[PDB]
Scaffold this active site. Structure first.
Site: not given
Ligand code: NA
Length: 314
Positions: A41, A44, A153
């Site tokens: 993805m 990951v 973030d």
């Protein structure tokens, strides 16, 4: 090096509990062969744990990998484990090791708010955003108040949703520990969601910033998700985006769309340019927008499933 001592100290603490996944109220012994790979993805990987059938997210830490990147993965892992009891932060099921790698098992969610925005090709409804705001503000407050951590973030790609209607914050790989409620690292974060005081500190002798910078990023994220467009999308460069954040009035929810008064107020408070007047999380949690959505029954799950059923992968 005190940076080296705490990194190996944290690594030891985690390696003590390695070799098993705690999932569904049961502890299972776990190796790489117990996990069926189902693709990356955009490392990951989405994997099926063969013993239970649960599909999970698996982060891969290499012994012979990027040293800065492995530091971020350990920082993210450390904050995740410490945040176990916060329901608005993704969960880790465990770790296991090879000679060359550390695999980290994480709760697979459905998708992120950025991808939902793309699938919608337009606004996410205020009622979904209200639940999201509650969840994310509680996650950020939890990190601040209990671990002295600033996320740095906050943006739609780090806000996750699943088919059970849960909303959670993720990715603390560039999170920082606050010293006297301040953070120093000026490179940590995505330019587009940076607060004015992080772009151009008002006092060049005291350039440090605090969680109010993340409050701004939340505001920008909310305007983006509520309208279906990043407020500075027509800027041709990052340097142009930042120049407007400095020089122009902050974005607001547009009044002609009819967003409720309390949502407009909340965003406007988050997008206060002068950071000395911008609320902290403890003040945002008293806001009537939050109070309204804390108690409101909203079927996020059905909405999520419907969207995922009706739209294509972006
Ligand atoms: Na958690």
């Amino acid at each position: 090096s005190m940076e080296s001592i705490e990194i190996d100290q944290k690594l030891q603490e985690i390696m003590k509990q390695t070799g098993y996944l705690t999932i569904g109220g049961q502890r299972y012994q776990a190796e790489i062969n117990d996990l069926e790979n189902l693709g990356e993805m955009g490392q990951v990987w989405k994997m099926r744990f063969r013993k239970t059938g649960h599909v999970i997210a698996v982060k891969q830490m290499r012994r012979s990998g990027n040293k800065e990147e492995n530091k971020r993965i350990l920082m993210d892992l450390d904050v995740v484990l410490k945040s176990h009891d916060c329901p608005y932060i993704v969960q880790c099921f465990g770790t296991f090791i090879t000679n060359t790698d550390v695999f980290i098992a994480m709760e697979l969610m459905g998708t992120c708010a950025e991808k939902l925005k793309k699938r919608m090709q337009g606004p996410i409804p205020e009622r979904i955003l209200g639940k999201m705001t509650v969840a994310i503000v509680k996650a950020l407050y939890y990190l601040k108040e209990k671990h002295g951590v600033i996320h740095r973030d906050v943006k739609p790609s780090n806000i996750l949703l699943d088919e059970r209607g849960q909303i959670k914050l993720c990715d603390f790989g560039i999170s920082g520990r606050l010293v006297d409620d301040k953070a120093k690292d000026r490179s940590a974060g995505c330019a587009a969601y940076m607060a004015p005081e992080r772009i151009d500190p008002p006092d060049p002798t005291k350039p440090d910033y605090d969680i109010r910078a993340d409050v701004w990023s939340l505001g920008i994220s909310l305007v983006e998700l509520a309208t279906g467009q990043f407020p500075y999308k027509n800027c041709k460069t990052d340097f142009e985006v930042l120049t407007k954040v400095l020089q122009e009035e902050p974005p607001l929810l547009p009044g002609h769309m009819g967003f409720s008064g309390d949502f407009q107020s909340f965003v406007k408070d988050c997008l206060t340019k002068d950071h000395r007047k911008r609320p902290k999380y403890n003040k945002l949690l008293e806001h009537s927008f939050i109070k309204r959505y804390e108690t409101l029954e909203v079927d996020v799950a059905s909405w999520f499933k419907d969207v995922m059923a009706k739209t294509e992968s972006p």
